Design a protein around this ligand. Structure first.
Ligand SMILES: Nc1ncnc2c1ncn2[C@@H]1O[C@H](COP(=O)(O)OP(=O)(O)OP(=O)(O)O)[C@@H](O)[C@H]1O
Ligand SMILES: Nc1ncnc2c1ncn2[C@@H]1O[C@H](COP(=O)(O)OP(=O)(O)OP(=O)(O)O)[C@@H](O)[C@H]1O
Ligand SMILES: [Mg+2]
Ligand SMILES: [Mg+2]
Lengths: 187, 419, 209, 419
């Protein structure tokens, strides 16, 4: 039943990412309000720029974590559905690709891997037919509702901010920034 | 009353506790005075009082018990102990003593000890019958220490190359030849946290000499293991006395079948303090260093050894170079052959934004064939042969761009040897 | 200092400035320095940011050495351990408070003054600060001011002080100015930034022209 | 009992027997203090005790007697010797003494000497009629010492090639030039154990100065003969004292027709200790080394000679080069051609996995004609001529793989001409 826990983790990651987005928007709007507020306040401007920088960095991190959780949910759902379906219809497709898997039996590692890859390309050529004709198909009815909640791939808002990559030094310094932000917010 | 967490906790709750019974205005003097006052107030009411500390003997047996979390300050909170009980219960310098504490009477202003219920983290009965540390026969390093946490953390990458640079063993005198601005401080704290997170059983200690208070408190709040940090405030006398007391405590702890690892930074400053605290012997070497100014640092650094049975003491010290001082050069030169392993922190690596700055070709280890498994040993040998020809910058680049993409050290070995 | 400098500073600076000429003995200097540092300590205790400009640490240390009693152990150049410990308490107050207030200390030191103990105590003060900048006589000889040496100057852990983009600008400037010499690089940077208005405009006009 | 068995025992059984007999809380003190207390109790009981050791005299006749096992430590167990018996028996420093020892009385804290039963493994009256070491006539190394054990040991190869590179004879002056990490310590201990195995008659002494404690204890364990080692913890004064004690003991012993060889690891460290222990003479050689100080090592190194009347004192020493300091090259240049036998070690030949790292082309011996046979000398010179045209890589690997395909050196001698 770990699919439910994975779904809950994805949902709370999405909620946390939305919280990060709205607080980043609030920081940006107050910063732009202070831009026209005049009166220098150079130290305040610098600290607000640091705040918005760490906000956008943690927004990017939360978006990446949400994407990772979403793809983990997709993977676990796929593996569970395939496992139950194979327990339901194993023999039919086992006999469809019979000769390679029947000669598989017990062999050496290289021969076993060669048979496995032959089976993979055979089923690739099998699936290419419906990849070509491709009529519409929906989610599995057993657990569609959860798949309905996530729907398609994560939205562009969760991936448009993940284009850039940060070196480990950047990650370390921004983690220090987050730690000092938390320490100064606690007081 | 287990004064340990009373001293550990910050000042706000201590002030509130002091003001609970209206102990005047105690938010002005030192923490030691506050602790002394509250202890005397609790003692005057008749309740039993307990205390613990580390022992340091004077020239007349007027022994003192210092607190580790107080950075071994000579405050009023130190517990006085008489020579009579020291002789009766066989007490020595650096021992940890916990038990009932006698409230002071007229004629003295320090809390005494009624009855010690624990010494050296075991029963006092068998604690008195122990072998001196120097009497134990030294040996070579046997147990390998893996700086890799194994969780694939991005912070552990540097630690990983350490396992690829020079293995860490028990009773191994390690040198870190690091010029200023070489990224040794965060490397040292990474090593300390790796040791704590991989070997919780082993006793971890960190030693800081004349360091800035911000770094001291950062280290205190960072590493879970206890760290002794003589700051940059006190003169050389306090530095040398705290170094002596901590090394004696380490010896006493390792005498009881306990593994102890101590990180020091930097040995150059400790040598400077020893040179400026020692009386002149009439023979001055180049750089204003006395003929006996090296005896104390050498004795301190040669303490680390692997005993025949029981825990082992291991010292890793950092030595500065190219600081523009000739005495730094001479102490580094006389500290070259005294260690069995050293890592060079190449300056040229630092400005290329590649870390850790390791001069892999120059750095090395000794007697590592009896430490690690021969398979990974010869794998490290062929890696060293591969890295030896090319320069340091490109070798570091080639190591970083291939060690970051892989998962662990053995995975890196497999991926490099499969191609 | 001479009365001229203290008078011109007190008639030129905005905030209150504490000064004491050499017409008074060294004990006056010691007492005024200790009272100023403890007053600043109290001010930062009351959660108030305070910045202390010290000019100069070398002369204050010399005065402390002249006034400190001898403990029997004297180093080379007539300097005692306590003779350097006494100015250490004045100099080491630089730290930050997390719940409010700050105590920043910026100090200057004198070298090549003809006395070897000056550079000795400078070496003792080499590794005590987290920010250093040097001044070169030859750069000031060319009548280009300030005579700052970009390669020699540096700040410890400046990444936390500034933002990421400012760090990138600072380090690309480091890479650009590092190869060539000091005087030529200084004059080149000063003339290329002279035509600008603000630092950000200079960075923008140097990064992509 | 006797000091001989007491000194060479681990402290475990010593403290157990002391507790069984019953002295005090005899756990927390030095081993020398434990021995002193046991001897005091035994003397109070009333049983006579023998004693033995090596005698030294101060500038005022205040004679001390130390033990070789304790590395000549100035502990309380050292025997006091008054000038009266020194003048009566006409003894000096380095004379081994054994006899009855007087227990200390009030007014002194050192064991005295009742009577001496023998001096330097000889009768007290017979050993008096002996001449000083400097009164002998030096001679070349007539006898030949062979490192071949004959058992075909797999690790004996490092010794075998030595006989093919530098013949060893009694009473010669040996020097070894070796960079750091050249495997010189293992070569020296292999030489020492080969000497002890092939030539059990000759007295073997191995001297270590400012070495790592693990190296000291492994020298103690591996070498069957007595080994004297002072670590770097003690100041250079103790290194000088122990070196002088050892060399003068060897000088006193060689007069008894004993062939004595002594190791020196290393001459550079001893020279540095001499430089830093002696007062400045007003003239300093460039770099910061006193020219007069270099006189002292010569006294230690100039005693290598062969005596027609009998006995042979041999000094085999190692030297350090390319250590990063300037002192090592100055010492090497000072001792450039002062020895009649030199053996070269190289780093580049050591980093290519061939051992021992001997530079065959440069390393050589002097006066091989009178030291070894004729036909073997011609065959080995033919081998050297074969080695000479090529470099050190191919020549060394070729010699190593040719000395490994057979067992007997004679068989190797008869195979190169056949092919
Ligand atoms: N793995 C790393 N990734 C990124 N930066 C690093 C890394 N290791 C070190 N550094 C950089 O190295 C710099 C060295 O600063 P630090 O003051 O800690 O150096 P140190 O070698 O301990 O010597 P000193 O305190 O005398 O300057 C740090 O400011 C940091 O930016
Ligand atoms: N034939 C050999 N086979 C394997 N390893 C060898 C061989 N010869 C030397 N070595 C290696 O050489 C290393 C050199 O260490 P060693 O302690 O012997 O050095 P040293 O030249 O005596 O000098 P120092 O101890 O001062 O470094 C040894 O740890 C050993 O592993
Ligand atoms: Mg640092
Ligand atoms: Mg060696």
């Amino acid at each position: 039943t770990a699919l439910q826990q994975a779904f809950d983790t994805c949902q709370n990651n999405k909620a946390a990412w939305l919280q990060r987005k709205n607080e980043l928007a609030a920081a940006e709007q107050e910063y732009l309000r202070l831009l026209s507020g005049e009166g220098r306040n150079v130290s305040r401007l610098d600290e607000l720029r640091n705040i918005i920088e760490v906000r956008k960095w943690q927004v990017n991190q939360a978006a990446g974590r949400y994407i990772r959780s979403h793809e983990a949910v997709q993977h676990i759902s796929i593996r569970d559905r395939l496992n139950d379906f194979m327990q339901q219809h194993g023999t039919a497709l086992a006999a469809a690709l019979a000769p390679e898997l029947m000669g598989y039996s017990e062999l050496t590692a290289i021969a076993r891997n060669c048979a496995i890859q032959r089976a993979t390309d055979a089923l690739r050529e099998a699936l290419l037919s419906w990849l070509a004709k491709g009529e519409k198909i929906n989610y599995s009815a057993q657990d569609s509702d959860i798949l309905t909640t996530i729907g398609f791939r994560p939205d562009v808002a969760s991936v448009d901010d993940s284009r850039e990559k940060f070196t480990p030094a950047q990650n370390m310094i921004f983690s220090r920034k987050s730690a000092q932000l938390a320490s100064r917010q606690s007081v | 009353m287990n004064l340990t967490e009373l001293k550990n906790t910050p000042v706000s709750e201590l002030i509130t506790l002091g003001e609970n019974m209206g102990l005047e205005n105690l938010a002005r003097m030192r923490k030691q005075d506050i602790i002394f006052a509250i202890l005397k107030q609790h003692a005057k009411s008749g309740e039993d009082i307990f205390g613990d500390g580390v022992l340091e003997i004077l020239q007349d047996g007027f022994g003192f018990l210092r607190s580790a979390d107080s950075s071994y300050l000579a405050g009023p909170d130190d517990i006085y102990v008489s020579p009579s009980q020291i002789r009766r219960f066989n007490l020595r310098t650096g021992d940890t003593i916990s038990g009932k504490i006698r409230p002071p009477k007229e004629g003295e202003r320090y809390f005494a000890l009624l009855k010690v219920n624990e010494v050296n983290f075991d029963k006092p009965e068998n604690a008195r019958n122990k072998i001196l540390f120097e009497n134990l026969t030294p040996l070579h390093a046997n147990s390998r220490l893996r700086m890799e946490r194994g969780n694939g953390s991005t912070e552990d990458l540097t630690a990983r190359v350490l396992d690829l640079a020079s293995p860490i063993g028990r009773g191994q005198r390690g040198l870190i030849v690091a010029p200023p601005k070489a990224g040794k401080t965060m490397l040292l704290q990474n090593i300390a946290q790796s040791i704590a997170y991989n070997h919780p059983d082993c006793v971890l200690m960190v030693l800081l000499i004349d360091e800035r208070p911000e770094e001291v408190t950062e280290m205190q709040r960072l590493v879970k293991g206890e760290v002794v940090a003589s700051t940059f405030d006190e003169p050389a006398s306090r530095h040398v006395q705290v170094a002596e007391m901590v090394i004696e405590k380490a010896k006493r702890l390792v005498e009881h079948k306990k593994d102890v690892i101590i990180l020091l930074d930097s040995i150059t400053r400790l040598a400077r303090a020893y040179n400026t605290v020692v009386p002149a012997s009439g023979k001055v070497l180049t750089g204003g260093v006395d003929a006996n100014a090296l005896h104390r640092p050498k004795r301190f650094f040669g303490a680390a050894r692997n005993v025949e049975e029981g825990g082992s003491l291991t010292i890793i010290a950092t030595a500065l170079i190219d600081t523009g001082s000739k005495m730094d050069e001479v102490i580094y030169e006389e500290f070259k052959g005294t260690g069995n392993m050293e890592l060079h922190l190449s300056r040229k690596i630092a400005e290329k934004r590649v870390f850790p700055a390791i001069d892999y070709n120059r750095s090395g280890t000794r007697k590592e064939e009896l430490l690690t498994t021969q398979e990974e040993l010869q794998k490290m040998w062929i890696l060293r042969k591969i890295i030896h020809p090319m320069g340091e910058i490109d070798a570091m680049e080639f190591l970083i761009n291939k060690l970051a993409m892989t998962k662990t050290n053995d995975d890196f070995f497999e991926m490099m040897k499969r191609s």
